[PDB]
Design an enzyme around this catalytic site. Structure first.
Site, PDB file in Angstrom:
ATOM      1  CD  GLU A  22      -1.625   3.591  -3.717  1.00  0.00           C
ATOM      2  OE1 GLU A  22      -2.412   2.663  -3.418  1.00  0.00           O
ATOM      3  OE2 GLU A  22      -1.946   4.480  -4.540  1.00  0.00           O
ATOM      4  CG  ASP A  31      -8.511  -0.551  -5.059  1.00  0.00           C
ATOM      5  OD1 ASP A  31      -9.727  -0.834  -5.083  1.00  0.00           O
ATOM      6  OD2 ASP A  31      -7.932   0.084  -5.980  1.00  0.00           O
ATOM      7  CG  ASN A 143     -12.522  23.402  -6.884  1.00  0.00           C
ATOM      8  OD1 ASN A 143     -13.634  23.228  -7.393  1.00  0.00           O
ATOM      9  ND2 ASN A 143     -12.175  24.523  -6.282  1.00  0.00           N
TER      10      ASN A 143
END
Ligand SMILES: C#C[C@@H](O)c1ccccc1
EC number: 3.2.1.17
Length: 175
Positions: A22, A31, A143
């Site tokens: 972050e 962001d 996935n």
């Protein structure tokens, strides 16, 4: 692995992990998805109105910040956000059993994913959750790499995916 390398895992934990993914910003910024954010990945609001974001900030910090906070304040908000993600997993009947089945390092990746996406978003990853419970780590990672979460903002998600594949901290080495 050198004596120092074997020490690297004792230095890594959920706080260090999310601090790398972050970053640390003391002023409101947008962001990768254009949402107003501050500190260590604290999403302030989805509203495009900076005034809403400053309003949320002053509520969150408890003082008139005018869009700027201290490092200590960033850390306190971060600790709260981490606690909320862990609490959100543990009380959820779908996420808790999968979390419990994971090793310590993949548990940090699970808390990271929930910090980033929220409980309902993560709980909707039906296939990945089953894959993780079944220790199908390569399939789980492939996935997760199909998701919008990863694909819209790969740099923030890529290390979490690698961590699910390997269960080690290697993705966080050598910044
Ligand atoms: C899907 C997925 C993982 O990030 C995860 C696995 C267990 C609990 C919370 C999140």
């Amino acid at each position: 692995p050198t004596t120092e390398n074997l020490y690297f895992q004792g230095s890594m934990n959920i706080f260090e992990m999310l601090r790398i993914d972050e970053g640390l910003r003391l002023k409101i910024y947008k962001d990768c998805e254009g949402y107003y954010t501050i500190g260590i990945g604290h999403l302030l609001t989805k509203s495009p109105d900076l005034n809403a974001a400053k309003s949320e900030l002053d509520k969150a910090i408890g003082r008139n910040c005018n869009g700027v906070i201290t490092k200590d304040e960033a850390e306190k908000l971060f600790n709260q956000d981490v606690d909320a993600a862990v609490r959100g997993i543990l009380r959820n009947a779908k996420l808790k059993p999968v979390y419990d089945s994971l090793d310590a390092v993949r548990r940090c990746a699970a808390i990271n994913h929930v910090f980033q996406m929220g409980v309902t978003g993560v709980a909707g990853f039906t296939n990945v959750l089953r894959m993780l419970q079944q220790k199908r780590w390569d399939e789980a990672a492939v996935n997760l790499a199909k998701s919008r979460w990863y694909n819209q903002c790969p740099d923030r998600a890529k290390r979490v995916i690698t961590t699910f594949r390997t269960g080690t901290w290697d993705a966080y080495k050598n910044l």
